[PDB]
Structure formats: structure tokens, C-alpha cells
């Protein structure tokens, strides 16, 4: 029962596979190799730079400058001890690209990009310090970055759109922007992926609610907060969570805080859910706080969600005349990036209603976080996260359904775990709600209940036969789901063993039936239930109550 | 008395290191990296170029084509593997980078320079089937630049040397016929460093035609001869030597070979060594077919032969702006590349020395080789082994010997070589020699006798004064290579033993009066004897011997 060893053993060595992949590494969109776009560039401006055995000319090949670095630190350092180095060298040159008046950040975002593969590449038992570093220098980067993200609720009635019409440089600091928001991202995912004991290892200055302005400048009330970097600073706040939820004494990390860095936070974020999803425009601009709408000038996956459409890499690819060392990027129009299918659009838009689970995966972790009593918190909250669940109630049953477009499998979904968002403050959570807030909102709670309460009727299906309409009406897309998850997807959906097809005609009527908000699993209504006929507050006396029995039958 | 294992090494894969090192290499003498010079190349005026998944557009990088190939077809093969693959591309790609009407050749010798790093890497059970078709496909390069090495015996009346006066492409095809004639060396000796078991399957008598070719084009009786193609050509002539010192039954590839090919090598190999040594002008032009003069035209190493000062190193560099993608080379003075200090005269002085031995060194191969004699077997070897014996003793101690220059160990060590030549002719091939031969020249062979008979006095040393005088008279130049060499490089230079304080002196002794003209080896001279006193042949009875007997004593 013994097992031997493998004679065969040629292990690629680790850096000599970085360093290559690095090389001819092609990013999503474009059409050249990373540092190969590398091998076009130089930094005219600033006539030389020297910071450790690494001059570069002032007509210098940057491209075989990096790479000249690259290989000749190779046989010098080791996959770690290269990382790090690398990490700070290409920082600096960082720093050097950005306090120059005239010179141009061409460079500077594929950087960004390629410093993210590298930590992405092998992010091993290294240590953060390294990480921190890159990570202030980037926050503050920002900060010297942060001419962009507050630019005005919109225009003025001059704030003129005549324009150079440069997506050149506005790609350029889109790019930047993004990219380093992603790298704030990254970085930080793995600090969310470090030996956990290194938890309070990521504790910075800069997170404790500051990084210049980060999340302020980010989730405006006064400009346009543009998805891309609001998925970021979001994603932030998620870090925050995360350090929450992971290490014995989180009691001790989750000090680090200020008060009211908390509230900036958390506001922000109710400030985020209570916009809206409307695919009517999501791809043209409207009213301003309310429509994560993610304009055109700028649409790609970013660097970790490979998200859609990606209408711009290929103009990655245009940036450099891929032939000559060159130090600003080549045109693009900004307009001809981008009747055909709306379908790309309703995934993206599936994708917003991802964006809408992860804003309520927030604030369970939000919920998670706060094991006592918080000045954060509203208090009332509880009762608008009952208003969200309200309104993809009452808007639910009159519009998005029977409409024969996936959105709405989440859009049902989100507001089923909703469910359970609230069915935690069942009894556990009922000591700190103020009177004042259970009854300023009378109405909607009690909806949000007597949604179930009339769910219940639980007479509806029974069978298929009547009910195959149903679905047959508009749930053709999700035949579509069935029909090609079925044809070549899985295994579990070919060869059907003699009880799935019997949990198709049932499964499907608990998922079709299950498109109008009718017909919740007994535990919906018996979640609403065991919170609601419990008589802990004075909902629900029957001298106010046989209304609600006697609407039910009774 | 086990030794445990050493597995835990982090090896670096043998792939691995090849293709990091091609990536970053940097050729001796010049300025910039191999690779990189390669990425500023660009294939003009053939518009499209591809043999197998190698597209290159019109105005593509060359040389990011490269290190695509390179790096694809990296996760594809193995070591060997990825060897013979390039050796095909390249070879396709030179070929018709040879034949085309307007196109320049710039790439070729650099890529050629790839050969190098290339076939030389690793050798070791590399096939002789790749080999072979580099190998005839370069020689058919060769023909296909044959338009060089038969260029006329001399600068005629009309002929003029105004000129564009480019070293452009002159160092261009200079390069590219001697890296070729140098790949024909380094894949010819990887030939003789393989397992002898894959041997004849490579040589037909194409090696016979092809090779013909070229040595007539090369070792011209009838143009300029040209010192490198000279080398080159000759040790090809000793690598056919070599695989007949090695072949156990070399009567295979003996029989290969014709009568008319071996007469044709040898007899050139005369025209070779009947030329002088003259440092007074070895780096200027006089009598030809005379002197092997390594003019600027063509001085630098070699691709192996570390010659001296180089002098076309960084103008390798200064082929390429190493900035810009190009073709053509960049321009270089044909003249100012090349009365400071004569010692890199010397050190040519000792390296043609080492020609000299290599003359005399394949003729005592071919000695030994042939134990049986043959057709080119015609004893003119005896006429001129021992003819050139007799010049390098005249000349030798009217001229040489005094000059305070350390060629003369050498040149002297030459001809205590010749001796064993000579005592090898003695004791093996005295079954053929031609009475029309011995008495065309009694004269040269007991000159030749008679210089160590009347060495054979014995009688000098009886002291240290005279012979330390004679020393500190001529051993000067000897004596700054004898002290740097004690006072700087030598483990043995330091701390001796007090058994060893007397092989200094005696062994400065030993070596000075060897230095003057005098007192050979008893070696020498008994050897020498063992074939005049001993009456094999009459050229020495007494009646006509007791003349020189009392000429020397006696």
C-alpha cells in the first residue's frame, strides 16, 4: 500500500515561467504583448532617471529598459524577493511619471496593469509591507489622481462638450483611475487572501477611513459616481468587512475605525442602493443619483471581473504605433467606440442585479460586523431594507414580470434573500429599534409582511397543466436556459436518471410559477410568520388583524 | 557510509536557461544585447515572409517575431527539440534572405550570431541530421556567397580603391562568410565531440563536393587569400583529419574521401606553410602567398579564437541606431577602426605561433593517421618537413633568437616538435623514401642533422654567472611575463617549499641557455643520432663523416 516518487520530475522553475509570461503577456481586448506595448515607449520629459543600478537613457528603449531590468535582476533575485523589488522599483518609476508638469502618463497605466499581473501571478506566504507600500503610494497616487472622480453633478449650462474628443486621455485616466482603484482592489484581496494571522499586518493609516479622500471623492452626492470606481471604493468597504470577519480578536481590528468613518461609509452605501435599475437607458445618461448607468466612455471588464462587451481593448491595442519608442498613445475616437442585440445590455444588466446582491451581501455583512449596537446605524434601516424589499415587491408584480428576459431570476432571487436579511432581526436584533422608527413606517414593514401573508394562500399550482401556459406566456428565455444548459452543458442535465425530469415538472413549476412574486417556499411564509403572528410588538391584534385573515378566506 | 539525497535544489529547467539566455545576450566586443538587436530589424523589400506559423508582416518587428516564435513554441518543445525547430526557421528564413535581388542582408549576420549562441548552447545528443542541414545549407550559402573569397591576387594597375568607401557591407559579407565558415567549425566540431556511433551517417560525398567548393574558393592559389577563411578552411581539412584519427576503421570515410580532394588540401596546405612569418608588416600588404597579414578589414576574434584587440567589437554595435526598427546597418568608417604599443603585435606574434604549431601539428596528424601509405604519400612531406626545419635553424639563430621578445620560446618549441616529426619519420616510414628524394636533397636533411650534431657538445652550463648573464642580456621581455606572472597570477607563485627555491634557478637556467641558440635536449640529440650515426642510409660512412667528426672534436 506503499506510493513512490515521480523519476519524471522537470519542473519549470517559477520565475523563469513569471518572467516569460510576463513578457509576452496579452491583456483582454488589446492585440499586443504587455511588454512588447512596453518596448514603444519613451520618457522624453524627464531627460533621465537613476534609482538602483537602473539607468535609462533619455531616448532609452523604456520597453528594454524594463525588460533589461527584468532579466537582469532575474538571476539576482528570487520569486518573492524579485516581486518586491520589482514592486518598488516600478513604484518609483511611478512616482517619477507623476509629479512632472509636462510630462505625459502614457506609460503609467500599463504599469498599473502589469504590477496587478505580477502580485496576481504568484501571491504566495509574502508579507504585506510590501504590498502597504505600493498600496499608499497608489492611494496617494489617487489623491494626485484625484482630479477626476469629483468633477460636477454634470455640466454647468456651460460646461461645454466641444471637445478635443480625446478618449486618449480620458481613456488615459480612466484607465488610471480604474486600474488603480483595481490595484487598491487586488492588493487588498490579497491582503483578503494572507495567512490570517496577518490580518491586523494590513492595518494602514490611509484605510483607517482617509487615502486622501478615496471613498469620498468615489461615492459622490455633488458629481457622477462612475460605476467602475464605484464597484471599487464598494469593494473597499467590503475589505473592511472582510478584515471584520476573520480573526478571533476581530474586537480588537475593528477599533481601528473612526466613528464617523463608519457613517460616511454606510450612508454612502444606502445612498447607492436607493438608486434604481432601468434598462430602458442604462447605457445613456439620466437622473443623476439614482442610475448606475455606466456611460459608454468607459466600457471594459476591468481588471478582475470579465464583465461584457470589453468596446475598448482593442483600442488598447491601438494605443501605440506598435513600431516606434514612442511617449503619448495613439488616437482614438471617442465617439466611434460604440440596435444590434440588447442582449449584451441584459447581461450586463443581470449584472447590475449582481451589483444589487453584492450592495445586500454588504449589508449582511454590515449586519454581521455590527454584534452590538452601532452609531452607524440607523436603527430604521432594518425598516428600508424592508422599503427596497416593498418597492421589488409592488414594481415586481406590475412591470418586470412578463417580460421574457432573464433579469428576472436575480431580480426575484435578491429580494428572496432579503428574506433572510430580515429574518435574522426575527427577535435575536428587536432591542434596540426605537419606537419612533417602527413607527414612522407603519406602512411599508407590515407590506413587507402581508406580502407572504397573502403569499400564503398556497393553493395556486398543485400540478403543471394549467401552469405550463404560464411559463409557455413569457419564460421562453429561461426554455432558453433549459434548452441549452441541457443540449451540451453539465452532465447532470444530459441522461436525465429517471427523477430529475420528475424534478423538471415540479422544479420548473416552483421556478416558473415562481416568476410573478406568488407562491414563496413554506419557509417564506412561515419566516414571515414565526415574526409576524409572534405578538412581541402590537402589529397584529385581532381587532386589527381578521381584516388580513378574513382578506386571506378564512 | 551512505550520502543522502539533494533533491530540494530549485533547478533551473535546461529550456529555461537556453531561452533566457538567447533573450539576453550580448556578443564580445560590442555594445547591445542579441535579441534586442534583433528587435530592430525589419525584412523590407520582401513584403510578406512565412514557412511555418512565422508570419512577419511588411514593415512587423523581425525581432518580436522572434522572441514570439521564441516564447510559443517554448511551452511546445524540449531543449533538442526547440534547437531544430529554429535551425529550420532560420534556415528557410537566410535562405531566401540569401536569394533575392534587392534585399540587403543586415539581418543575416546577426541571426548568424543566433547560429552561434544557438548551435554551440548544447551540443550534446543533438542529431547529425539537423546538423548536416545547417550545415550544406550554410556551404550553399557559401556558393551563394563564393563571390568573396576568390577576389584577384591584387589591387590590379586599373582597379581602383576609390570607393563608397563603406566597411558596411564589406563587414557585412565579412562577417557573414566568416560566421558561416565559423558555424561550418563550431557544428562540424560538435560533429567530432558527438558519440562516435553517429558518425558516417552524416558524411557522404556531398561533405566531399560542397566542402571542395568552397576550400578551392577559399585557400586561392591564383587571388588574395584571406586570413580567416584561411583558418577556417584548414581546421575543416583537420576535422577530416580528425574523424580519421577517430573512426576505428577510418578506412570508411578514407575511402569516402578522393585521391584528387586529398591532393588538393595538402598541396595547399604546402602553399600555406612556405609563407613566412614576418611581424615587421603583418599588419600591412607585401608580398602575397607569403604572408598571413589579419589586416583591420578583417580583425576581430573569431567566433571562438579570442585573437587580440577585437578592434570590430562595438562596431558591431554601431551597426544597428539600437533604437529604431531597421534593415540596413548603420554606417561605419572602413578606416578609422584600427605606434601605441606593439605588444598586440606580440601577442599576434605568439597566436601565429599557434598556427605555425597547428601546421605542424595536422601534418604529424596525417603522419600518424597514415601507418599504411597511399597516393598523396610521396614523401615531399620529408623534402619539406625537413626543409622548413632547416629554415627556422638559420634563420633562426642569424635573426630571432636575441630580439628580447618571447616569440622566440615558441618558435623554437615549434621546431622541438619537428623533431619528434622528424625522429617519427625515423622510426616508422623509412620503407618508402625515393632514391630520386634522398639525393635531390642530401643537402636539407643533414643540415638538419648536423644543427643538433654540432649542438651535441654538451658542454655548457659548468656554472650559474654566464648563463643568468646571458639571461639578463635577452630574457628581458620573458622575464616581465616571468614576474608578472609570479607576482600576480599563480597559487604555485608563492610560498615554495624549499625543494622548489632550486627548480627556480635551475629551471631559469635550463630555460635560458634553451633560450640561446644552444645545448638542446639530450633527448634531442640522441634521437637525432639514433638516425645519422645509425648507417640506415648512406649518407654518413666514416670516410665521409670523420670530416664533420673533427669539425665538431671528436
Known amino acids: 500500500n506503499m506510493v513512490p516518487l515521480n523519476p519524471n520530475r522537470i519542473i519549470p522553475d517559477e520565475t523563469s515561467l513569471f518572467l516569460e509570461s510576463i513578457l509576452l503577456h496579452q491583456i483582454i481586448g488589446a492585440d499586443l504583448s504587455t511588454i512588447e506595448i512596453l518596448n514603444r515607449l519613451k520618457l522624453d520629459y524627464i531627460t533621465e532617471f537613476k534609482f538602483k543600478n537602473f539607468v535609462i537613457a533619455k531616448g532609452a528603449p523604456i520597453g528594454k529598459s524594463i525588460v533589461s531590468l527584468l532579466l537582469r535582476c532575474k538571476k539576482t533575485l528570487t520569486l518573492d524577493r524579485f516581486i518586491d523589488t520589482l514592486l518598488e522599483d516600478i513604484a518609483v518609476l511611478i512616482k517619477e511619471i507623476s509629479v512632472h508638469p509636462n510630462e505625459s502618463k502614457l506609460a503609467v497605466p500599463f504599469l498599473v496593469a502589469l504590477m ?31 482630479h477626476v472622480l469629483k468633477v460636477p453633478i454634470h455640466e454647468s449650462n456651460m460646461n461645454l462638450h466641444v471637445e478635443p474628443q480625446i478618449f486618449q486621455y480620458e481613456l488615459i485616466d480612466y484607465l488610471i483611475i480604474s486600474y488603480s482603484f483595481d490595484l487598491l482592489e ?11 494571522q496577518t490580518y491586523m499586518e494590513f492595518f494602514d493609516e490611509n484605510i483607517l477611513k482617509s487615502f486622501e479622500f478615496v471613498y469620498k471623492l468615489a461615492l459622490t452626492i455633488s458629481y457622477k459616481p462612475m460605476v467602475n470606481v464605484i464597484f471599487s471604493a464598494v469593494e473597499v468597504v467590503n475589505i473592511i468587512t472582510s478584515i471584520i470577519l476573520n480573526m478571533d480578536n476581530s474586537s480588537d481590528l475593528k477599533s481601528l475605525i473612526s466613528g464617523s468613518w463608519w457613517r460616511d461609509c454606510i450612508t454612502r452605501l444606502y445612498a447607492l442602493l436607493e438608486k434604481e435599475i432601468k434598462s430602458g437607458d442604462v447605457y445613456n445618461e439620466n437622473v443623476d443619483t439614482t442610475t448606475l448607468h455606466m456611460s459608454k466612455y468607459h466600457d471594459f471588464f476591468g481588471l478582475i471581473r470579465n464583465i461584457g462587451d470589453n468596446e475598448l481593448g482593442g483600442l488598447i491595442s491601438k494605443l501605440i504605433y506598435t513600431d516606434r519608442l514612442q511617449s503619448v498613445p495613439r488616437v482614438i475616437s471617442k465617439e466611434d467606440i460604440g440596435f444590434t442585440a440588447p442582449i449584451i445590455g441584459y447581461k450586463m444588466e443581470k449584472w447590475l442585479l449582481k451589483l444589487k446582491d453584492e450592495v445586500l451581501n454588504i449589508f449582511e455583512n454590515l449586519l454581521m460586523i455590527y454584534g452590538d449596537d452601532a452609531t452607524i446605524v440607523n436603527g430604521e434601516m432594518l425598516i428600508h431594507s424592508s422599503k427596497f424589499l416593498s418597492r421589488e415587491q409592488a414594481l415586481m408584480i406590475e412591470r418586470y414580470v412578463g417580460q421574457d428576459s432573464p433579469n428576472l431570476d436575480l431580480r426575484c432571487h435578491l429580494i428572496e434573500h432579503t428574506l433572510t436579511i430580515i429574518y435574522r432581526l426575527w427577535k435575536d436584533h428587536f432591542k434596540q429599534l426605537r419606537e419612533e422608527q417602527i413607527k414612522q413606517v407603519e406602512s411599508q414593514l407590515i407590506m413587507s409582511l402581508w406580502r407572504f401573508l397573502v403569499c400564503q394562500t398556497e393553493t395556486v399550482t398543485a400540478n403543471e397543466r394549467e401552469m405550463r401556459d404560464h411559463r409557455h406566456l413569457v419564460d421562453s428565455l429561461h426554455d432558453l436556459t433549459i434548452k441549452d444548459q441541457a443540449s451540451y452543458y453539465e452532465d447532470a442535465f444530459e441522461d436525465l436518471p429517471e427523477y430529475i425530469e420528475e424534478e423538471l415538472k415540479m422544479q420548473l413549476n416552483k421556478r416558473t410559477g415562481r416568476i410573478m412574486q406568488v407562491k414563496y417556499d413554506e419557509k417564506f411564509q412561515e419566516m414571515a410568520r414565526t415574526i409576524l403572528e409572534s405578538k412581541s410588538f402590537d402589529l397584529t391584534t385581532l381587532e386589527e388583524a381578521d381584516s388580513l385573515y378574513i382578506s386571506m378566506g378564512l
Request: hydrophobic share 45%.
Open 116 to 146: 496587478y499581473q505580477i502580485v496576481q501571478f504568484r501571491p504566495s506566504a509574502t508579507h504585506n509591507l510590501a504590498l502597504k507600500d505600493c498600496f499608499l503610494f497608489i492611494c496617494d497616487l489617487i489623491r494626485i489622481y484625484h
Open 186 to 196: 487586488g492588493i487588498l484581496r490579497v491582503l483578503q487572501s494572507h495567512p490570517k
